[PDB]
Amino acid sequence: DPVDYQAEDATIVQGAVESNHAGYTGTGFVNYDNVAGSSVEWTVTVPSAGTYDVVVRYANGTTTSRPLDFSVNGSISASGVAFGSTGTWPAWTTKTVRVTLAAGVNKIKAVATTANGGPNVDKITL
């Protein structure tokens, strides 16, 4: 139904696939490098054009938000989405971002806007 798209199987720019915090799904997660512009870009397929709720499963073991810009097929989707603390790195949490998609194959990209980089990201589901 909802379909999982694992971060570690996506296109990663300035990040690393890791597995040293428990509770991820798939074979690991992406640890964004601690730079602005680090990103993950998923290739997804949906049956019809329209709105989709993209459920981002992430962790942030710090008190500082790590915001992401989301874009869809190269156009901004959601700007400045905060990813706040989860207390600990294994405390994976979800946040929903609504992204407009075309029927069929689309790319969804989440890029870090601050020098902190992104939260750790397990997957998106939609």
In whole angstroms, the minimum distance from the beta carbon of 80 to Ca ion comes to 19
39 binds Ca ion (CB under 5 A): no
6 binds Ca ion (CB under 5 A): yes
Amino acid at 26: G
CA 43 – CA 12 distance, rounded (Å): 12
With H, G, I as helix, E, B as strand and everything else as coil, classify residue 62: coil
Written as six digits, the tokens of 2 are 């909802």
121 binds Ca ion (CB under 5 A): no
Only one of the segments 70-78, 80-88, 105-113, 118-126 lies at the binding site for Ca ion (rule: CB under 5 A); that segment is 118-126
Residue closer to Ca ion by CB (options 55, 73) is: 55
Q: Say how many CA atoms lie within 13 Å of 76 toward its Cβ.
A: 7
125 binds Ca ion (CB under 5 A): no
Among the listed residues 4, 13, 26, 85, the single contact to Ca ion using CB under 5 A: 26
Among the listed residues 5, 10, 21, 24, the single contact to Ca ion using CB under 5 A: 24
Interrupted after residues, the chain (C–N over 2.5 Å): none
